[PDB]
Design a protein around this ligand. Structure first.
Ligand code: HEM
Ligand SMILES: CC[C@H]1OC(=O)[C@H](C)C(=O)[C@@H](C)[C@@H](O[C@H]2O[C@@H](C)C[C@@H](N(C)C)[C@H]2O)[C@@H](C)C[C@@H](C)C(=O)/C=C/[C@H]1C
Length: 394
């Protein structure tokens, strides 16, 4: 029953997966497919079923409920909140929930604004008048913010670029596994280096919590925490900033509307999340029992991917779904997930995106793409919507 090989779909599917998902949705909610790595997974498509499944407790995130074995490098890192169910998820999330409320994140606005102002200064100083938004803004800003929060020294941040690149588009399945092993070894060394140093960063606080009471946070969960907060704190926000400006720049009429009325900025970032959000499919879910989806039963322990990208093109929920419309009703989009695993970072992601978008539009007079929208290259990863590069001009 694998009705679709995702590996045999080419850059056409990478750049525009939506017709493929829409044809699946017309048949039903759940479809067995083959990942590019040859693994069999289920896709859940359509807004209503995707939203329901994201929050449905019958779909676990704990790999003890998955029949697909974890690799050695993955098993070193899986004791994290996103790959946990209650009660473990509940305890782990409580440890950092307070750090990421909208009120605490707003205390970061001065620093974020200062980072954005600096990065945009560097861009506008270009010897030509052109730049890659990927290298000039979308990559440096989130990695800088999350590194300062988790106390990652500046010389160490370069390796995160390489590791993330190996996670998104590895040369072979081994290079991603190798990147995970190096990242885990580094994080374990970083964790130990905070001991006794009285750091005020979030990682140092977590290390102390674990050292004080292994029943509140084990050493395995401490490494899982650092990992999850750094990876999820990074590559999704990079692509929100890139995908979001690609959306504005590829729709010059909406770029003009927003530039003419910055009070639309908040809705525009929400439509940015709706229209081309960085998460194409949610992270792995495993039914704890066979689950019947309108006649399609998924066996217990199979892998289930909720295709957020298709949910956001469901016309019943988002009329004229293929139109990027910054004044559209975006209520209930799933770009941050839904349920107990809803993104803990959403206020910080939104803060970074809003400041970055505003700064580009207020300070780059005639901002425009440097290539045509169809010339842009997208990474083939079915989990992520990401641009290889974003050439711009002003
Ligand atoms: C600003 C930096 C961010 C940090 C630190 C962060 C952190 C996290 C963490 C720790 C989780 C797991 C929560 C749990 O399991 O209870 C999570 C979930 C999630 N985040 Fe974020 N996040 C960030 C930004 C983003 C962005 C920009 C997006 C995409 C628009 C995003 C999308 C998601 C989604 C979809 C999930 C749920 C995955 C699923 O249910 O399988 N996050 N995030
Ligand atoms: C929260 C939405 C983003 O997901 C993540 O960043 C989470 C925290 C994450 O780090 C994992 C889900 C990674 O996914 C894969 O990592 C591979 C190296 C191993 C793989 N295996 C178990 C099948 C799986 O865990 C993440 C590094 C994946 C890449 C593509 C990514 O950046 C995804 C981001 C969002 C889905």
């Amino acid at each position: 029953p694998p009705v679709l090989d995702l590996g045999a779909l080419g850059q056409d599917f990478a750049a525009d997966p939506y017709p493929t998902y829409a044809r699946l949705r017309a048949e039903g909610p759940a479809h067995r497919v083959r990942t590019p790595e040859g693994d069999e997974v289920w896709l859940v498509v359509g807004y209503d079923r995707a939203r329901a499944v994201l929050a449905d407790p019958r779909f676990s995130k704990d790999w003890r409920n998955s029949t697909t074995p974890l690799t050695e490098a993955e098993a070193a890192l899986n004791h994290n909140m996103l790959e946990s169910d209650p009660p473990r998820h509940t305890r782990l999330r409580k440890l950092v929930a307070r750090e990421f409320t909208m009120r605490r994140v707003e205390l970061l606005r001065p620093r974020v604004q200062e980072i954005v102002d600096g990065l945009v200064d560097a861009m506008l100083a270009a010897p030509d008048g052109r730049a890659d938004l990927m290298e000039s803004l979308a990559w440096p800003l989130p990695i800088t913010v999350i590194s300062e929060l988790l106390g990652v020294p500046e010389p160490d941040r370069a390796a995160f670029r390489v590791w993330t690149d190996a996670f998104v588009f590895p040369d072979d399945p081994a290079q991603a596994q190798t990147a995970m092993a190096e990242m885990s070894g580094y994080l374990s060394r970083l964790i130990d280096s905070k001991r006794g140093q009285d750091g005020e960063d979030l990682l140092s606080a977590l290390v102390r919590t674990s050292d004080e009471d292994g029943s509140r946070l084990t050493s395995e969960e401490l490494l899982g925490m650092a990992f999850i907060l750094l990876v999820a704190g990074h590559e999704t926000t990079v692509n929100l900033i890139a995908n979001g400006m690609y959306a504005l720049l590829s729709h010059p009429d909406q770029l003009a509307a927003l530039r003419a009325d910055m009070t639309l900025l908040d809705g525009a970032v929400e439509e940015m999340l709706r229209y081309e959000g960085p998460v194409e499919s949610a992270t792995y879910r495993f039914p704890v029992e066979p689950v019947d989806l309108d006649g399609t039963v998924i066996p217990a322990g199979d892998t289930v991917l909720v295709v957020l990208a298709d949910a956001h093109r469901t016309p019943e929920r988002f009329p004229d779904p293929h139109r990027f419309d910054i004044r559209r009703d975006t209520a209930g989009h799933l770009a941050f997930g839904h349920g107990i695993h809803f993104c803990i970072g959403a206020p910080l992601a939104r803060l970074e995106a809003r400041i970055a978008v505003r700064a580009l539009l207020e300070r780059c007079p005639d901002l425009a793409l440097d290539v045509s929208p169809g010339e842009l290259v997208w990474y083939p990863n079915p989990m992520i919507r990401g641009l290889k590069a974003l050439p711009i001009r002003w």
